[PDB]
């Protein structure tokens, strides 16, 4: 019946303000100086990156800005048919590896990153030692669409996602005191992922 579209107060406040300016989006876009060499930021669209079709390779690229406070939201656009076997979206410290040999959910694989595998609907963090957690929590009878929002609350130390205008709930906790960057892990040849910062709330 009626799906719930209620969202936490602060997210409502932020989303009530006008979207961030082009200059602000660019300030928080993919960093061409902090990427896997198998990936490159599109010359004609600094908000989108492209992955060379390298075999047995998992590649990542970080956003230009590391966040330490405030509520921040950004939109990720990842064509569904361009995800392959492992497509993870999340955040990480500046130390997270941007590349690995073979195909896997690199983001969320060590204690340096936190990610949501869009194909497995699972949350990963320190994956080597910790088991993944289903998300969103199943209750009925879930596919992640082409676009959705990521919400990092550094004041509370949480990461959450909003799909189809629906708040999916807190995915990770314990991020307080860190400096986190937006990050993605991909393995599909020629995939293009777009990240557009929506806004930050200093509340």
């Amino acid at each position: 019946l009626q799906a719930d579209f209620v969202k936490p107060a602060r997210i409502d406040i932020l989303l009530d303000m006008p979207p961030a300016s082009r200059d602000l989006q660019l300030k928080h876009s993919w960093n061409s100086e902090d990427r896997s060499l198998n990936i490159f930021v599109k010359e004609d669209d600094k908000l989108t990156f492209h992955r060379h079709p390298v075999a047995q390779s998992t590649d990542c690229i970080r956003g230009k800005v590391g966040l330490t406070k405030g509520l921040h939201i950004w939109e990720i656009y990842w064509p569904t048919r361009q995800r392959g076997t492992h497509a993870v979206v999340g955040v990480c410290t500046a130390d997270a590896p941007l590349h690995s040999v073979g195909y896997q959910s690199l983001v969320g694989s060590t204690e340096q990153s936190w990610g949501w595998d869009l194909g497995r609907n699972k949350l990963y963090h320190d994956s080597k030692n910790c088991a993944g957690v289903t998300y969103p929590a199943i209750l009925k009878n879930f596919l992640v669409p082409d676009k959705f929002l990521v919400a990092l609350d550094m004041d509370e130390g949480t990461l959450s996602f909003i799909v189809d205008q629906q708040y999916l709930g807190i995915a990770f906790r314990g991020l307080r005191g860190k400096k986190l960057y937006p990050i993605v892990s991909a393995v599909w040849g020629h995939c293009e992922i777009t990240m557009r910062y929506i806004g930050g709330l200093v509340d």
């Binding site: 896997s36 060499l37 198998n38 060379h52 079709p53 390298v54 075999a55 047995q56 390779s57 590649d59 392959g84 076997t85 941007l98 590349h99 040999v101 195909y103 393995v187 599909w188 040849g189 020629h190």
Partner: peptide, 15 residues
Amino acid sequence: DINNNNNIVEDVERK
């Protein structure tokens, strides 16, 4: 292959 990649491409990140 499965993830739409091919072995002809040079993996600059590995090298």
